[PDB]
Amino acid sequence: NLFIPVFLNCWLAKHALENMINDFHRSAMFNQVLILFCTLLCLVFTGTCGIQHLERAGENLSLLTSFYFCIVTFSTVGYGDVTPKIWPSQLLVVIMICVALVVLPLQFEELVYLWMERQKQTEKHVVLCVSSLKIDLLMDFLNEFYAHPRLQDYYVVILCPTEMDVQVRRVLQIPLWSQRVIYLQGSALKDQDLMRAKMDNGEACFILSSRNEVDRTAADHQTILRAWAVKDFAPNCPLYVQILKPENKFHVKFADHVVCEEECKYAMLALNCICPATSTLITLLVHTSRGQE
Amino acid sequence: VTFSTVGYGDVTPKIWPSQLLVVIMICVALVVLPLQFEELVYLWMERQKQTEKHVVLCVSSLKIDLL
Amino acid sequence: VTFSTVGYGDVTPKIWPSQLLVVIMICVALVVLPLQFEELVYLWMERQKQTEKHVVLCVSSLKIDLLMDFLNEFYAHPRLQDYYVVILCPTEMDVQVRRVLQIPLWSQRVIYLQGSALKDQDLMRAKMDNGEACFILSSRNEVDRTAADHQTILRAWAVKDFAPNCPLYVQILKPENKFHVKFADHVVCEEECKYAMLALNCICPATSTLITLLVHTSRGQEGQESPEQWQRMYGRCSGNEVYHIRMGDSKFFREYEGKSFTYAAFHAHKKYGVCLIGLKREDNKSILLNPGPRHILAASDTCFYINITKEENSAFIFKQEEKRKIAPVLELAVEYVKGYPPNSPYIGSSPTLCHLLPV
Amino acid sequence: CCFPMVYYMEGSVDNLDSLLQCGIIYADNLVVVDKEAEEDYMADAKTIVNVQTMFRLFPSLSITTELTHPSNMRFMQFRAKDSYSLALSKLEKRERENGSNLAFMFRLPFAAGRVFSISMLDTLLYQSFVKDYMITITRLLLGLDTTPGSGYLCAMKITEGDLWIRTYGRLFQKLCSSSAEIPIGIYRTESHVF
Numbered sequence: 035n036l037f038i039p040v041f042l043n044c045w046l047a048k049h050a051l052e053n054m055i056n057d058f059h060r061s062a063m064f065n066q067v068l069i070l071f072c073t074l075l076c077l078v079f080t081g082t083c084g085i086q087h088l089e090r091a092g093e094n095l096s097l098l099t100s101f102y103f104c105i106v107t108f109s110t111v112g113y114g115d116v117t118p119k120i121w122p123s124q125l126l127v128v129i130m131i132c133v134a135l136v137v138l139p140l141q142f143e144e145l146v147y148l149w150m151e152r153q154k155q156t157e158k159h160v161v162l163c164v165s166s167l168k169i170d171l172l173m174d175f176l177n178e179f180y181a182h183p184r185l186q187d188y189y190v191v192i193l194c195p196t197e198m199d200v201q202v203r204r205v206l207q208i209p210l211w212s213q214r215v216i217y218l219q220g221s222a223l224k225d226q227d228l229m230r231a232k233m234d235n236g237e238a239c240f241i242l243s244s245r246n247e248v249d250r251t252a253a254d255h256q257t258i259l260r261a262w263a264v265k266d267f268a269p270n271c272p273l274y275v276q277i278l279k280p281e282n283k284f285h286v287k288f289a290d291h292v293v294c295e296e297e298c299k300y301a302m303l304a305l306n307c308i309c310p311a312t313s314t315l316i317t318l319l320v321h322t323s324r325g326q327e
Numbered sequence: 328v329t330f331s332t333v334g335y336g337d338v339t340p341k342i343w344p345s346q347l348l349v350v351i352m353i354c355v356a357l358v359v360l361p362l363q364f365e366e367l368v369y370l371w372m373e374r375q376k377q378t379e380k381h382v383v384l385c386v387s388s389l390k391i392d393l394l
Numbered sequence: 395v396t397f398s399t400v401g402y403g404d405v406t407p408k409i410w411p412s413q414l415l416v417v418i419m420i421c422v423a424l425v426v427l428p429l430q431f432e433e434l435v436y437l438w439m440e441r442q443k444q445t446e447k448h449v450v451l452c453v454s455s456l457k458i459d460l461l462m463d464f465l466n467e468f469y470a471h472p473r474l475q476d477y478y479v480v481i482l483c484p485t486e487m488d489v490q491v492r493r494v495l496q497i498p499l500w501s502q503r504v505i506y507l508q509g510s511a512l513k514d515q516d517l518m519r520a521k522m523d524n525g526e527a528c529f530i531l532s533s534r535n536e537v538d539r540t541a542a543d544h545q546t547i548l549r550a551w552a553v554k555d556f557a558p559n560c561p562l563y564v565q566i567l568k569p570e571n572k573f574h575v576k577f578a579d580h581v582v583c584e585e586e587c588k589y590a591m592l593a594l595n596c597i598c599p600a601t602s603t604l605i606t607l608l609v610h611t612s613r614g615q616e617g618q619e620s621p622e623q624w625q626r627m628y629g630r631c632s633g634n635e636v637y638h639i640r641m642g643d644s645k646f647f648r649e650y651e652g653k654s655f656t657y658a659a660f661h662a663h664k665k666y667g668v669c670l671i672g673l674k675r676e677d678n679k680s681i682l683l684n685p686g687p688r689h690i691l692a693a694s695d696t697c698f699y700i701n702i703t704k705e706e707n708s709a710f711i712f713k714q715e716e717k718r719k720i721a722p723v724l725e726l727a728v729e730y731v732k733g734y735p736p737n738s739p740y741i742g743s744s745p746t747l748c749h750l751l752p753v
Numbered sequence: 754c755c756f757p758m759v760y761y762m763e764g765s766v767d768n769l770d771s772l773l774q775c776g777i778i779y780a781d782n783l784v785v786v787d788k789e790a791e792e793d794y795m796a797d798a799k800t801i802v803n804v805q806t807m808f809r810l811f812p813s814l815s816i817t818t819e820l821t822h823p824s825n826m827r828f829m830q831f832r833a834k835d836s837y838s839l840a841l842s843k844l845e846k847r848e849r850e851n852g853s854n855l856a857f858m859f860r861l862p863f864a865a866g867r868v869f870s871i872s873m874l875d876t877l878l879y880q881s882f883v884k885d886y887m888i889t890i891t892r893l894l895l896g897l898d899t900t901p902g903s904g905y906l907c908a909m910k911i912t913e914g915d916l917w918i919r920t921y922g923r924l925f926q927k928l929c930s931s932s933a934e935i936p937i938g939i940y941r942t943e944s945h946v947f
């Protein structure tokens with residue numbers, strides 16, 4: 035009938051749990067958070083058993099009372115209704131406070147490191163695949179897409195390899211577009227980035243060529259590859275391809291809707307020479323408006 | 328004075344179910360509030376990226392010599 | 395309990411000088427400790443900018459497709475599971491590479507070191523002196539391949555200078571630079587193999603596919619649920635690899651001691667489905683593909699065979715053999731000149747007797 | 754200069770005028786080794802499309818290409834209106850699900866030898882950490898190293914006069930009894946009207 039600190043053995047169980055985490059999951063930062071709760075549990079559970087047993091000589095604290103005493107201690111509340119009345123109990127609180135203040139921060143910094151390295155919906159969505167997204171292109175899509183009442187329950191996934199533009203970020207922070215627009219950094223040529231975009235469930239996919247790029251043949255090659263990648267991954271997803279050069283237009287003929295920029299640009303410019311302001315007439319017709327301007 | 332961790336102790340739970348309720352109420356406080364704090368941190372992080380008679384200065388690149 | 399802000403109150407200052415001392419000490423604590431904290435934060439900010447049997451991987455830029463190819467092949471073997479991988483790369487870790495390293499499977503196995511093989515300090519951090527092997531891989535994305543080959547030659551020399559007893563596995567782009575790393579234990583020239591396979595595809599169709607499947611570690615389990623018969627066979631037969639075993643120790647070929655090479659090759663295939671493709675005599679270091687019928691087998695020869703599983707790893711079929719328990723092959727056996735191309739373009743070009751123009 | 758019937762000409766695979774001058778109407782094989790991005794998989798975009806254009810202009814021509822990324826092998830000869838090649842995507846995704854390193858394997862162009870990737874040589878080097886003979890065997894098959902007394906990789910056509918040899922084992926017996934050649938495998942072709 036001798037006292038043996040079996041309660042400190044709970045610390046080793048925490049260690050036996052740490053080596054568990056290395057091999058099998060059962061969620062990369064979740065494990066450390068679970069570990070942080072474990073050392074918190076060991077901190078509290080050691081406090082209850084230590085205070086209950088050391089006070090067995092003085093004031094004879096019950097386990098439930100010492101548990102409440104321990105919780106209000108490590109939370110720095112310090113009610114003072116139950117206090118250690120003898121020196122070894124007072125000392126144990128001191129070393130437990132010091133142990134808490136030197137063990138918990140180490141867990142916090144491991145949390146901080148994981149959070150730092152970590153920093154680097156509904157139905158009926160459409161995916162928008164671009165090489166670089168700028169505010170002029172994004173707002174043109176958003177104005178036209180959400181000008182219709184039928185597509186208001188739709189959200190937009192933007193699959194773009196480049197990092198999100200600063201101007202694009204500010205518009206996405208607007209509450210109107212915060213819930214509607216998701217920006218994914220990835221490639222249509224990686225099926226993993228297509229799984230994150232839920233392209234197999236997308237209502238439509240819009241592959242848009244980059245007109246700012248100085249090499250338009252290279253840009254057309256990328257959109258042909260993107261269209262093929264989407265067709266390979268999700269065959270039953272309507273493709274809406276924007277092609278720059280007419281010579282590359284028969285490589286995406288399978289797509290449901292294809293717009294060749296050079297054909298329409300020069301045919302309208304030629305018609306403006308025949309019928310004045312044909313470009314203006316076409317422009318207004320293809321724009322959804324209620325005639326309230 | 329409890330959630331602010333002051334803990335005066337002039338008024339304290341004198342029976343076990345309240346002592347348990349205070350214990351669980353501290354625990355939910357320490358697990359619910361940090362989630363709000365973390366969301367506040369995210370919003371602050373992404374947020375980081377007068378009088379009359381003023382004058383506007385339009386330049387393409389501003390250097391210290393010109394300013 | 396005061397500076398920890400617990401404030402139990404069982405012991406309190408009962409006189410004004412003691413109460414004032416607590417007040418000034420609390421204020422002193424709140425103005426002295428933060429200064430230490432900010433210095434700690436200042437040190438922590440700038441600070442932000444294992445086991446045995448590891449392997450070092452020296453690259454100029456590490457991309458995800460290169461890393462996963464190494465990781466898939468390296469850890470496809472049960473023997474190399476206790477091994478961890480050090481990546482010595484001058485460039486900053488790629489974002490895509492970072493995400494894969496965060497995966498718990500590769501978190502403990504892969505260490506990424508930013509450094510140069512040409513700095514011995516970065517070689518000491520990589521523990522190259524203790525590494526089981528070093529892999530120097532050329533960067534093919536680089537537009538200047540001569541420059542890339544120069545960097546890998548320098549890297550191979552730096553590793554050899556630092557750790558002479560470390561097997562070097564060098565990937566060389568251009569054949570002209572291949573004799574500068576001839577000292578390395580294993581060298582792969584990309585341009586030689588690329589164009590020889592492309593040329594063989596013109597002679598033997600899909601030679602590149604045949605070589606590709608053979609050099610890939612697989613168990614032949616692909617497309618086994620496929621309804622198509624060709625996919626099931628094709629995925630099964632892709633599990634073939636090339637293995638070596640001493641003939642005397644080989645249950646496949648030990649019964650053919652003193653028989654011709656082709657006799658053993660035919661009969662071991664007829665019995666076990668293994669393809670004896672070559673052998674290496676104990677006297678020489680040269681491996682011979684199909685020595686022929688005049689070659690007589692001996693117990694000291696090392697036999698190279700193609701099979702789905704290693705013979706030792708095929709301990710089941712031998713027990714499965716115990717579960718069951720055309721003329722015959724003999725036991726005993728302008729016109730062009732034929733010459734060598736005169737001007738060898740580079741050093742190390744193996745001389746092949748070719749059809750040559752008379753002039 | 755000493756090799757018979759080796760000629761050169763200026764042009765590219767994207768220039769149809771140069772290709773018709775080379776004799777692409779009379780060419781059994783067209784090997785494209787052309788070399789030409791921030792997004793990694795887009796490095797093959799120009800080679801894939803240029804090869805695709807010839808695939809449509811000369812459907813019967815045999816084009817062999819080398820690609821930087823094995824993930825791009827599905828784009829060698831792309832039939833978007835083809836349920837079979839589109840179903841191969843599901844099969845390859847399933848193999849990738851099971852952790853197979855050979856997931857590109859069931860793509861038709863790779864299976865036919867129309868494409869290979871240079872990343873395979875990386876696997877050959879990594880394999881050499883476990884198989885020190887693997888590099889030597891590969892070069893012996895490719896003829897890259899020539900050891901006196903070592904064989905060479907060849908191919909034989911099984912024509913209608915050879916179908917009396919019903920099985921592959923009997924072919925092994927016949928070859929090993931007459932010419933002492935060792936069959937490595939079979940290149941099989943099936944009727945797959947698209």
Ligand SMILES: [K+]
Nearest residue numbers: 612633635702
């Ligand atoms: K195998």
Ligand SMILES: [K+]
Nearest residue numbers: 607610633634
């Ligand atoms: K294999």
